[PDB]
RNA sequence: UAGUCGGGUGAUUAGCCAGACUCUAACUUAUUGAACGUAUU
């Protein structure tokens, strides 16, 4: 991981410098170049810049995945490295995952959830609390506070 | 083309200085209303309807950088390189398609009336006016060639089919001169003329309606 | 693992459900019965679910179509992207723009699906290392990336075809595994329990070849179901295969006593409607056929019920499709008398054999018949097999078609096959007049291959004038520019406006030339005389106004 | 020459201009609700500056002027 | 109109209800490793 991060330091620096001028923010989770902006029709030229910079730096060793270049807007689904971005411009787990978690908690309510699924639900709830703290409050309201407290356990 | 009347210069242009500041630094949300209130969403050189439009410079900044942040050089033409395409009309073809042209050989709609340089026909093509000799005829020909007014089909065909859609109206108006009184016929012609401004091509219909 | 696959499969994912089904089936029979399991039923319901919409057409729950196509260094394209429509996509442009290349790439991509449906881990077609790679290039390799949609359970099926040029040390590989996985799902589910299979056909320029049924073609028993995938993406439909299959169907229909007593009973109860009125000469050798119907009673009493042949239904469906889509053809059948088997059609009320068709009625009939045969053979569980899903590639759909036929070919094809994704190229404004603007993907006239992500036109082509489509979409004059007679109206405009709007010697000469060439009733002379009338009285009114303006 | 209509007969949207012309001819010329809805859907389908919309506008212009001429003739005398 | 977002109800990954968005335009992915959250500690 650290070698991979260092080998892309110059690429990250040059891409960030180019993107800040055109009001584009750039992040990379070591394989996922994410570019976003509020200016329309500004992200069209980003892939060409990426290709020319990669050819300048790494030659033919590192290449973009052209089948993995996706344009998205508020008209469609928007998720970055697993976190859905809402039309309200806030982080979310996605409606489908939230309904799955709700079903898991409902199954735990009637005692139809086994130990493996219970541990999976506890891990998912911790991840949700990290990502969507308001979802925990909503589940506390919907499924009562005592049920949630017994599900997460006590120290 | 129309004779365009200038107005008070927007204050956002005086904020920046040519040379030190780049054209991309400004926001176009301040110059577009100023262009629109005098052009009414019609192409600075083509009377194109401004559905896909951009800010156009009469003198390109590559060879005339000193004419950057001046409202006199600013114009609203059709097309947009930002939205991509192969536009070959008004400003985009002026900058890219034509090439090797002289700035002073193009009529400016700001100070020069295009009516006495250009004539619009029933067939839909624009030709220099009758009697143009010397620099006027060459200037009109250069304007037509650079702006591709006689050229790309999307303009010639559209203008021709717009003009030919009003020819029955023109015939019916002018064929009843003896029936109507001079004042009544004149006011009816004025009514016909005053509400073709809502139409797309100003002068072609004006040339098909006026003497 | 089993838990994660169960969590994904119960949410609607098809790949996880198939993985669970396979891991159950290959295990001990305690959990594997090859079927009658939750996961197998989930997969087969996902494939087979559908509903009849308000118009009476079966609509599958999970449609199958191609979403995106990317061409990297392929032929003349440095990097191109397309956004294929769900129902109909039209690609237009000048000659040598890459429409045939796009169709060829799509067919090469679909070949892997076809091969892995027919044959486990089968090998499809590959890009040519001699012609397909761009001549200029920078890396001397080409990629063709495709993404397919198969419902919400399978939102993306990425398949990439890659090839490197001759004499290159580094060879690029193809990523065709997801297509193999999807076709494995189709094939395994179909063998366990019959399902409806997709249709993949390519109709390129290699169609319109002369003759039909050249050889006996010992090629694999056209009757069997998986013969519908044989040479399906070759470019030219196997019309000889269709003729052999049609004669097979006719033999099966007329050689069944149950399927012959029905027509015998109806044929007997037709002379009674005729011989009763008169014509005592149409009974001597026709009431003898009543004895045949009586003989059919002793030739029967083994079926009693049913007596609805599947082959007869297939024949009727194919005949109805052929008659509905092709405008000139009214009927089609097989004659056995004169004991070579031959197929006859009815063109404009005249019964003609299959070999005396023209080029344009035979090519279109070949396309329609081949497509109908493949749809019928691959969709046995549908009430209307032509409503099955699939992808069909047609190149130059207006081939050998009169402008009258071009006005209805798209509508007829879309009506006969409503669930097929049609990807079509054309050079005609007449066909475009029947197609929505959103379904057209155009090439910029000044393009050398560096353009990316094609766009739809601006002007709404559906219901528009053909001349307007030529002007704005085809980028072509409605009046030829190389003809001197085309500029005569403009020249008359100039020579009339020159003095005051009045005629003179040269203007009158030009008017006489226009009248003699175009004629009296021509719209050119009408425009010229309307122009003269307008200008003369404009000049009169101008003089009148100038009189009082002094 | 080829006996082919300019617009496709099998497309419903291709008959809207003729229907508008007939529905404006039978009426007094004013844009009633029946003509207004057809004009609105023509504008929505073909576009703001399509040839169909320009032709419809020209028909409106000529019908209005013809009505004005008829009114003038009626006002001239009885 | 689609498609998308997701607040609620729902023995609950389904169905429904309310609301909202629309650059030509998401397709939800990967461990035991790395980091993050959580639990023991
Ligand atoms: N390998 C290649 N490299 C570069 N240009 C190519 C290559 N193969 C074909 N071309 C060019 O690209 C075009 C291909 O034509 P084609 O795809 O059949 O288009 P269409 O169906 O529009 O006429 C032609 O102009 C041909 O010269």
From TrEMBL, chain A:
Domain of life: Bacteria
UniProt family annotation: Belongs to the bacterial reverse transcriptase family.
Protein name: RNA-directed DNA polymerase
Organism of this sequence: Escherichia coli
Residue numbers of the full-length protein present here: 157 to 311 of 311
